[PDB]
Amino acid sequence: FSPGDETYQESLLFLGVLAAIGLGLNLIFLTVYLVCTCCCVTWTAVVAGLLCCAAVGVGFYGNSETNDGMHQLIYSLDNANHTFSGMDELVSANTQRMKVDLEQHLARLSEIIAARGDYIQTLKFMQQMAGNVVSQLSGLPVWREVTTQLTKLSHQTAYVEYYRWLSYLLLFILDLVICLVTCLGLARRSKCLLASMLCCGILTLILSWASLAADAAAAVGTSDFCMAPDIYILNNTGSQINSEVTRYYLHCSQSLISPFQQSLTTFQRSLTTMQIQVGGLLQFAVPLFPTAEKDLLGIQLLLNNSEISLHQLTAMLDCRGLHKDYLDALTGICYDGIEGLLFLGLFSLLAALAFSTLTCAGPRAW
Ligand SMILES: *[C@@H]1O[C@H](CO)[C@@H](O[C@@H]2O[C@H](CO)[C@@H](O[C@@H]3O[C@H](CO)[C@@H](O)[C@H](O)[C@@H]3O)[C@H](O)[C@H]2NC(C)=O)[C@H](O)[C@H]1NC(C)=O
Ligand SMILES: *[C@@H]1O[C@H](CO)[C@@H](O[C@@H]2O[C@H](CO)[C@@H](O[C@@H]3O[C@H](CO)[C@@H](O)[C@H](O)[C@@H]3O)[C@H](O)[C@H]2NC(C)=O)[C@H](O)[C@H]1NC(C)=O
């Protein structure tokens, strides 16, 4: 989690040091074997080579699987970023255009109707429920902070996946090079280089066991964290957003509550009233100047655009797409990363066994 001292971190560290103790017992087993063989057949080497080839292959499969999983997680985060960015742009544009509409309505009324000054009550009415609409739309949840934190998480996971991809392909390359130099030493007469590469192989064994440790730690941590993630997302993020909206988004396979149809109804009725009053101004604009009629027709098309924007908005608030993105992210984390990372754990175990067998076949050369 966030702090550096708790049971979860201690549990993961205990698993890691248990794997390190496994590495230690492996190395002391190697030491006792070497001292026993210094105190006073091709089948095993062939089996070791086949096992190490199978290990590196299954590890490459696991790394590709986790690469694909992280890639689709980043894709889902990108879709969520796009959706919230579109929501934010739509709401900001609607507010900005509404303010512009208020100011231009004030201008066109002062230009013409100020001479008569009889529909001042109507003008005050439009002003008052326009302000009511502004207040009601101010109640929508702004999505700037979630976009910022999700972009930060996307950057972090991109960096982490790039680092892991590079490091583990380095590990695959090193394993292949060790296999090739083993074959070359088997064929060509053993030079001192076969005595030099023994320490390199031992260090690579140590690295493989450390990989097993970190792999098991990450696997258990991620599995436990995404077993019931909803509580974690509520705790870490649900501070400036009320719990009901978060629970709606995280769990809306059915229409649980959806406590926002009142807002859509009030905007729809406000806009219908706006259409009615605009039509009233048109039908009072017959004896007036054509400039008033042109402005009114422009306002009518403007209201049409506002209505279609509101329809796009209410399409975007519906939790189908966001819930689909969440479910895709959840499955791509657990059901993909866990399995790939476990396959990588089997990689580490099999590679450790393979190095053990090669060291078993080490001293017998000379
Ligand atoms: C979603 O991910 C994209 C990553 O491609 C990021 O979008 C950000 O949105 C801004 C606009 O608000 C974009 O600005 C773009 O960059 C040029 C740079 O000169 C700018 O002048 C233009 O206005 C152009 O639209 C840009 O794609 C990006 N901003 C950055 C990278 O600083 C962002 O991570 C996410 N979008 C959000 C959070 O709105
Ligand atoms: C903004 O949208 C409104 C409606 O959404 C439109 O203004 C006028 O709307 C009425 C009612 O929909 C239209 O009357 C109907 O026209 C159809 C055309 O096929 C006709 O079949 C019906 O019997 C009825 O008469 C009216 O035509 C329409 N005004 C214009 C100029 O088309 C219009 O889409 C937008 N208002 C503008 C551009 O001023």
Numbering used by the authors: 34 to 73, 89 to 414
The authors write:
Tweety homologs (TTYHs) are conserved transmembrane proteins present in all eukaryotes including three members (TTYH1, TTYH2, and TTYH3) in humans. TTYHs have been reported to form Ca2+- and cell volume-regulated anion channels structurally distinct from any characterized protein family with potential roles in cell adhesion, migration, and developmental signaling. Each protomer consists of five transmembrane helices (TM1–5) and an extracellular domain (ED) which extends 75 Å from the membrane surface between an extracellular N-terminus and intracellular C-terminus. We conclude TTYHs are not pore forming subunits of anion channels and their function may involve Ca2+-dependent changes in quaternary structure, interactions with hydrophobic molecules near the extracellular membrane surface, and/or association with additional protein partners.
To test this, we purified and reconstituted TTYH2 into lipid nanodiscs without Ca2+ and in the presence of EGTA to maintain low free Ca2+ concentrations for structure determination. We also pretreated filter paper used for EM grid blotting with EGTA to sequester the high residual Ca2+ known to be present in this material to prevent Ca2+ transfer to the TTYH2 nanodisc sample. The Ca2+-free TTYH2 cryo-EM data did reveal a change in oligomeric state, but surprisingly we identified two different conformations in approximately equal proportions: the expected monomeric TTYH2 (to 4.0 Å resolution) and an unexpected head-to-head homodimer (a “trans-dimer” to 3.9 Å resolution) in which TTYH2 protomers embedded in separate nanodiscs associate via a buried surface at the distal end of each ED. Protomers within monomeric, trans-dimeric, and cis-dimeric TTYH2 adopt overall very similar conformations (pairwise protomer r.m.s.d. = 1.3–1.5 Å) with conformational changes largely limited to subtle rearrangements of side chains. The pocket and unassigned density is similarly observed in TTYH3 cis-dimers, TTYH2 monomers, and TTYH2 trans-dimers, suggesting it may be a conserved site for binding small molecules or extended and primarily apolar lipid headgroups. In contrast, it is exposed in TTYH2 cis-dimers and monomers with ~250 Å2 of solvent accessible area presented to solution by each RGD. Notably, reported human TTYH1 and TTYH2 structures determined in Ca2+-free conditions are also cis-dimers, while we observe monomers and trans-dimers of mouse TTYH2 prepared in Ca2+-free conditions here. For dissociation of cis-dimers into monomers, these include: (1) the affinity of TTYHs for Ca2+, (2) the related dependence of TTYH oligomeric state changes on [Ca2+]ext, and (3) the range of [Ca2+]ext experienced by TTYH-expressing cells under different conditions.
